[PDB]
Amino acid sequence: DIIIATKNGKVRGMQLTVFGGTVTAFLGIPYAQPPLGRLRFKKPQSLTKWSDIWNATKYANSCCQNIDQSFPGFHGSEMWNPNTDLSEDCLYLNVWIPAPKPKNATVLIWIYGGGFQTGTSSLHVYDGKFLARVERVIVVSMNYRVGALGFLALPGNPEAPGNMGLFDQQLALQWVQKNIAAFGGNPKSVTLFGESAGAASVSLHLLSPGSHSLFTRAILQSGSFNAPWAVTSLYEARNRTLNLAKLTGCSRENETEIIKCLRNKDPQEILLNEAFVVPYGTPLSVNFGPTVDGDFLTDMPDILLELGQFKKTQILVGVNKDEGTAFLVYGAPGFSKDNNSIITRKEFQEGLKIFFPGVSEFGKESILFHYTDWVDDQRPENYREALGDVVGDYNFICPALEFTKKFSEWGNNAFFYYFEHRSSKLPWPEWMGVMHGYEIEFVFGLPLERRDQYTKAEEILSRSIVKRWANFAKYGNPQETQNQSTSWPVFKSTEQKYLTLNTESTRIMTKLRAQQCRFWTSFFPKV
Ligand SMILES: *[C@@H]1O[C@H](CO[C@@]2(C)OC[C@@H](O)[C@H](O)[C@@H]2O)[C@@H](O[C@@H]2O[C@H](CO)[C@@H](O)[C@H](O)[C@H]2NC(C)=O)[C@H](O)[C@H]1NC(C)=O
Numbered sequence: 333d334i335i336i337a338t339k340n341g342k343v344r345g346m347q348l349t350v351f352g353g354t355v356t357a358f359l360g361i362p363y364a365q366p367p368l369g370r371l372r373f374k375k376p377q378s379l380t381k382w383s384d385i386w387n388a389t390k391y392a393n394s395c396c397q398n399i400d401q402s403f404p405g406f407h408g409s410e411m412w413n414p415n416t417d418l419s420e421d422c423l424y425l426n427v428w429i430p431a432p433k434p435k436n437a438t439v440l441i442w443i444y445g446g447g448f449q450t451g452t453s454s455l456h457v458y459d460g461k462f463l464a465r466v467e468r469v470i471v472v473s474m475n476y477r478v479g480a481l482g483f484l485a486l487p488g489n490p491e492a493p494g495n496m497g498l499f500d501q502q503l504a505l506q507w508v509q510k511n512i513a514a515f516g517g518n519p520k521s522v523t524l525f526g527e528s529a530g531a532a533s534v535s536l537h538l539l540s541p542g543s544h545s546l547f548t549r550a551i552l553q554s555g556s557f558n559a560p561w562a563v564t565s566l567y568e569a570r571n572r573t574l575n576l577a578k579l580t581g582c583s584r585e586n587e588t589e590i591i592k593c594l595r596n597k598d599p600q601e602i603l604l605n606e607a608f609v610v611p612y613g614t615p616l617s618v619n620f621g622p623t624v625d626g627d628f629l630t631d632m633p634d635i636l637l638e639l640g641q642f643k644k645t646q647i648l649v650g651v652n653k654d655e656g657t658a659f660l661v662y663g664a665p666g667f668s669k670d671n672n673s674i675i676t677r678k679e680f681q682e683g684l685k686i687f688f689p690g691v692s693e694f695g696k697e698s699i700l701f702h703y704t705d706w707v708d709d710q711r712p713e714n715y716r717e718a719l720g721d722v723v724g725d726y727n728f729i730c731p732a733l734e735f736t737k738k739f740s741e742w743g744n745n746a747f748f749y750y751f752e753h754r755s756s757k758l759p760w761p762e763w764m765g766v767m768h769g770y771e772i773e774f775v776f777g778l779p780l781e782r783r784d785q786y787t788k789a790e791e792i793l794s795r796s797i798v799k800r801w802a803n804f805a806k807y808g809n810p811q812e813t814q815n816q817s818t819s820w821p822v823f824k825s826t827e828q829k830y831l832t833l834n835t836e837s838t839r840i841m842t843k844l845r846a847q848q849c850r851f852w853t854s855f856f857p858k859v
Pocket residue numbers: 664665666667668670671672673674
């Protein structure tokens with residue numbers, strides 16, 4: 333009933349009833365020629381004009397990916413698996429615009445995480461219709477190729493240059509540039525936001541010169557490119573794809589002939605060998621991920637960060653209180669989502685070997701040293717809580733803090749939050765705490781659905797969070813001005829102030845996990 337004319341053709345949307353109002357969803361618009369046939373592994377190719385009206389009325393195909401199978405029938409895990417047909421034909425995106433059509437609204441662009449191996453924009457917790465409704469921003473999300481099909485790399489070779497998933501992202505950003513005006517959006521006020529691997533994607537779009545002109549601002553949720561899992565080395569990248577070449581019988585001398593050999597293999601056989609390529613995998617392993625390809629990424633990101641080579645603008649950055657616990661039940665011994673996983677000193681030690689496999693015996697002892705100095709002896713949760721902190725502090729909280737320090741050191745406004753509210757609809761047990769990934773729903777305004785059994789404190793917090801994100805998007809400043817909400821101070825290198833987000837106190841604190849992270853960011857990286 334509502335048709336928006338785009339630069340490639342007409343598209344018919346769909347009308348949703350949201351909170352006594354209306355949002356217009358355009359679900360499943362393609363933003364690239366499908367990366368099939370000879371196009372597999374190659375950069376996303378431009379999409380040529382269509383003559384008809386494309387029907388963007390259902391989510392499109394999710395890109396190929398392995399599914400999480402460790403808890404069949406358990407919502408806490410299955411809520412993250414694709415809710416849409418897998419297919420190599422998956423370069424599509426979604427647009428939620430407020431009804432009535434705005435004049436030119438801030439656009440929020442969501443980039444999902446999932447280790448760069450999994451994920452889809454279709455997910456229930458990435459629904460932008462609440463944001464379009466409640467704050468009159470336009471929400472855009474895109475599907476981008478993951479795992480090997482998105483990030484397999486023989487650096488140099490254009491048949492598989494690496495970073496194709498990032499280029500998918502970027503070409504969707506280009507689409508919002510050429511097209512969001514027709515939807516009533518302002519291409520000049522575009523805020524990227526994403527979570528974990530999506531957050532690290534957003535941070536890399538700050539470094540990549542071809543994205544500098546495609547967005548204004550950046551929100552980084554539980555992830556940043558300087559995290560240990562974010563970049564696979566050029567050594568690792570090559571050893572990873574050769575392992576894949578052996579395991580599919582495509583081992584050749586000629587590099588390009590390897591590639592087209594892996595191009596007549598089917599998505600299923602490629603998907604199934606991807607898991608075995610990681611020499612010693614961990615719950616945190618990125619089988620096939622971002623590389624310094626020389627195209628999207630011209631140098632090693634930690635040097636671009638260290639010497640100020642990034643887009644100058646405001647960042648909103650933050651992490652959750654128990655980032656690390658989700659991964660503990662994917663391999664660590666003595667752990668379980670179904671009991672309270674009290675572990676002993678020897679199970680903890682065995683857990684370090686599982687999360688730090690190729691790390692020195694003395695390196696692992698150093699982790700044990702800094703994290704086993706209890707305030708007190710007999711508290712049996714000590715080892716269980718410690719291994720969660722170790723994995724959280726090392727993988728998320730401290731790369732994020734370090735990213736924000738170094739990024740603020742170049743004069744730009746930065747805001748750090750510490751999300752510490754555990755969802756009352758949280759399917760995982762309570763020892764797991766304020767888990768990785770479970771701020772997302774608050775950011776998207778789901779607790780504003782009074783029908784969805786969230787408590788009223790939750791609805792309030794999500795409303796405040798949603799106002800802070802929209803104000804950051806619109807005005808570069810994540811305050812809630814109207815109600816008497818705590819002012820959110822900018823994060824500066826000396827004082828390192830951050831805002832805590834929760835049901836009760838919105839309090840201002842300083843120097844989060846400071847002692848833990850002098851360890852990780854300045855002693856451990858040497859072992
Ligand atoms: C918490 O649970 C783990 C694992 O197990 C449970 C809940 O899930 C898997 C089932 O097959 C088990 O029967 C059990 O219901 C316990 O860890 C196990 O401990 C055993 C000693 O009793 C060892 O022989 C096993 O190797 C070990 N298995 C794993 C996967 O860790 C753990 O002891 C439980 N802890 C508490 C405090 O209940």
